[PDB]
Design a protein around this ligand. Structure first.
Ligand SMILES: NC(=O)c1ccc[n+]([C@@H]2O[C@H](COP(=O)([O-])OP(=O)(O)OC[C@H]3O[C@@H](n4cnc5c(N)ncnc54)[C@H](O)[C@@H]3O)[C@@H](O)[C@H]2O)c1
Ligand SMILES: NC(=O)c1ccc[n+]([C@@H]2O[C@H](COP(=O)([O-])OP(=O)(O)OC[C@H]3O[C@@H](n4cnc5c(N)ncnc54)[C@H](O)[C@@H]3O)[C@@H](O)[C@H]2O)c1
Ligand SMILES: COC(=O)[C@@H]1c2cc3c(c(O)c2[C@@H](O)C[C@@]1(C)O)C(=O)c1c(O)ccc(O)c1C3=O
Ligand SMILES: COC(=O)[C@@H]1c2cc3c(c(O)c2[C@@H](O)C[C@@]1(C)O)C(=O)c1c(O)ccc(O)c1C3=O
Ligand SMILES: [Mg+2]
Lengths: 289, 289
C-alpha cells in the first residue's frame, strides 16, 4: 500500500502536501474531524480518501493509519488546548505510527527548533522531534521558516495612499520565508526518496527579505508607494486581535536576535521550482484591500 | 539600602518569601497591581512597603526596583497571556534589574528546568534563567519541586469511606515535594549569603513519596483508610476543571519518565526545619473534606 495519511489536510501545510502527493502519484488519505465540511468534500472531489479522526483521540489515529505507507504529521497550537495540546498531539501521531507499522513519518517542525530558541511553540516541536527520534520510526523532519502565505490575511494596508507593512521587526532584520506549496513539495519528495530523506532534518526557505524589502515587493506589484514600520514587541504582545500574541511576540523577538538559517541556494539546487516571495504574490494574485 | 522587592507578593511563593525576609530583618517592598486589595492591605499592615506595578509593564518594573538591593522574581503562566506572557515577564524583570542596578536577583524556576524536560512551563523558566545569565545580573536560581501546598485545593476525597488520591502517576512513580514556606526560607537565605548563593542554582525538595505513600500520609493524619489510583494522561489532559490541563498532563508524564532530582539530605543539613509532607499536613491542619 502506497497511501500517505495526511494530518491537517484542510489546513495550509496539509493542503499543500495533499496537492504535491497527488501530483507525484501517491494515494492520499486525509484525517478530518468532520467529513461533511466544504473543505473535506473538496478533498474527496480531488481524489482523496477521507477518514474520520482527531489528533486528541489516539485510537482514532491508529485507525486512520491502517495499512498506510507514510504519515504527514502537522499540528497547530492555536486552539483552546494550546501548546500542551500541540505537544501531546505530535507525540500521539508518533506513537500511533509506531503501533501500526507506518514505514515513514514526515513531521513538520519549524526552523530553529534545534537551536534552543526558547520560543514556546518552537520548543513544543523540538520535543516532538525528540520523541520521534526515540521511537526509531523512520522519520524526515521539515523545518519551515516564515510562511509567505501569512500575508494573505496579515498583509499591508493603505495609509494615506502608502502601503504599510507593520511588524515587530527592526528595519534591518532579515527574515527567511517559505511558500507553503514548497513544504508540500518537500514532503512528497521525501516519501519518494527515503534513501536521501529518512533520518534527515531540513530547514526550508525560498527567499530572505527585510521588512522594507517586503514592503517594496508589495508596492512594486500594486503600483503604489510602500514602506515598512517597526511595531514594538510589547505592543505586539498585547494585541487583542492576534491569537497567542505573547508567544508570537517572543517569536518575533527571536527573529530579531537570532533568526532562521536555511541554505536557500542548496534548496533551490534540490528543488529548482522553489518559490520566491515575488512568486507567491503572483500565484495568489495579491491585491490591495 | 537592603530592601528586597518581592514580585508575586500576594501569591504562594512571594508570600512565603515576604515572611522569611521579615524574619531576617530585611526591609521588604511588594509589587502589587492593585494596592487596595485585602491581600495588599495585609502586606502593608505587616510593615511591607507597597509599590504599584505590573509584570507586563516594563516602566513600572523599573520604578518598582528604584534603590532596592534585591528582587525576588516569580511569574505565573495560568493567565490570559499564558506561557508567552510568563516568559516575557520573566525576561522583563531581568531587563529591569539590569537597567536599575539591582545587586541580586533570586529567580524561582522549577526542578528539572536544566534537564531538557520539554514541559512547556519548564522550558519558559529555562529560557528566563538563560536570559539572566546572559545579562550578567547577579542571580540565584531556585528550582522548586511539587508544591505540597497544591494539596490544599486538590486534596483527596472520601469515596465509600476511603480517602482517594487520584493523579496521573504510576503507582511506582516517586515524586519530590517542597513546602512553599521553605522556598521562602531559601530565597531569604540566598540574599543574606551571596558568597554562597550568587551564581548558584538549587533544586528544592523536603520529601519524596509515591502516590500510595501520599495517600498513606493523609490516611495516617485523618485516621481512616486511604488509597492511590492512577488517572490516565489523556483523561487528565482533557479535564475541563483543570486550567492548562494539557501542559499539566505533559508535566505529569515527565514525572513518570524522569522527575525531580533535589538532594534532600543536603538541603536538610542547610535548613534543619525543612518540612516533610507529614509536617506540612500538620502545619495546615489538614482535615477530611
Ligand atoms: N505560519 C507560519 O509562518 C508558520 C511557520 C512555521 C511553522 N508553522 C507551524 O505550522 C503549524 C500549523 O500549520 P498550518 O499553518 O498548516 O495550520 P492550519 O491552521 O492551516 O491547519 C490546521 C489543520 O489541522 C486541523 N486540526 C486542528 N485541530 C485538530 C484535531 N484536534 N484533530 C485533527 N485535526 C485538527 C485543522 O482542521 C486543519 O486541517 C503550527 O504548529 C505553526 O507553529 C507556522
Ligand atoms: N504549584 C507547583 O507545584 C509548582 C512547582 C514548581 C514551580 N511552580 C511555578 O510557580 C509559579 C507560580 O507561583 P505561585 O504558585 O506563587 O503563583 P500564585 O498564583 O500563587 O501567585 C502569583 C502572584 O503573581 C501575581 N501576578 C500575577 N500576574 C501578575 C502581573 N501581570 N503583574 C504583577 N503580578 C502578577 C499575583 O497577583 C500573585 O501575587 C508558576 O510559574 C509555576 O510553574 C509551581
Ligand atoms: C505577516 O505577519 C503575520 O502574519 C504574523 C504571524 C507570523 C507568524 C505566525 C503567526 O501566527 C502570525 C500571526 O500572529 C499574525 C502576525 C501579524 O503576527 C506563526 O504562528 C508562526 C509559527 O507558528 C511558526 C513559525 C513562524 O515563522 C510563524 C510566523 O512567522
Ligand atoms: C495534587 O495535584 C495538583 O494539585 C495538581 C497540580 C500539580 C502541579 C501544578 C498544577 O497546576 C496542578 C493543578 O493542575 C491541579 C493538579 C491536580 O493537576 C503546576 O502548575 C505545577 C507547576 O507549574 C510547576 C511544577 C509542579 O510540580 C506543578 C504541579 O505539581
Ligand atoms: Mg486514497
Amino acid at each position: 500500500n502506497r497511501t500517505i495519511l495526511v494530518t491537517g489536510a484542510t489546513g495550509t501545510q496539509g493542503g499543500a502536501t495533499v496537492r504535491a502527493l497527488l501530483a507525484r502519484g501517491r494515494p492520499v488519505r486525509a484525517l478530518v474531524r468532520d467529513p461533511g465540511t466544504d473543505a473535506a468534500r473538496a478533498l474527496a472531489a480531488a481524489g482523496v480518501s477521507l477518514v474520520t479522526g482527531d489528533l486528541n483521540d489516539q485510537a482514532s489515529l491508529r485507525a486512520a493509519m491502517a495499512d498506510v505507507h507514510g504519515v504527514f504529521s502537522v499540528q497547530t497550537f492555536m486552539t483552546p488546548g494550546g501548546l500542551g495540546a500541540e505537544l501531546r498531539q505530535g507525540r500521539a501521531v508518533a506513537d500511533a505510527a509506531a503501533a501500526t507499522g507506518v514505514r515513514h513519518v514526515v513531521y513538520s517542525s519549524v526552523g530553529g527548533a534545534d537551536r534552543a530558541s526558547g520560543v514556546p511553540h518552537f520548543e513544543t516541536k523540538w520535543t516532538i522531534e525528540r520523541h520521534l527520534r526515540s521511537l526509531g520510526v523512520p522519520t524526515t523532519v521539515l523545518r519551515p521558516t516564515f510562511f509567505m502565505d501569512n500575508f494573505a490575511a496579515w498583509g499591508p494596508q493603505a495609509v494615506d495612499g502608502t502601503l504599510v507593512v507593520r511588524l515587530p521587526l527592526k528595519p534591518q532584520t532579515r527574515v527567511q520565508l517559505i511558500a507553503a506549496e514548497d513544504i508540500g513539495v518537500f514532503a512528497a519528495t521525501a516519501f519518494d526518496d527515503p534513501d536521501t530523506y529518512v533520518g534527515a532534518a531540513l530547514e526550508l526557505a525560498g527567499d530572505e527579505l527585510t521588512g522594507p524589502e517586503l514592503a517594496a515587493r508589495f508596492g512594486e506589484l500594486a503600483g503604489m508607494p510602500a514602506r515598512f514600520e517597526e511595531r514594538s514587541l510589547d505592543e505586539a504582545a498585547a494585541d487583542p486581535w492576534i491569537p497567542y500574541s505573547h508567544e508570537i511576540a517572543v517569536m518575533f523577538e527571536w527573529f530579531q536576535t537570532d533568526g532562521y538559517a536555511a541554505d536557500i541556494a542548496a534548496l533551490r539546487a534540490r528543488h529548482p521550482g522553489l518559490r520566491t516571495f515575488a512568486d507567491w504574490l503572483r500565484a495568489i494574485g495579491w491585491r490591495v484591500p
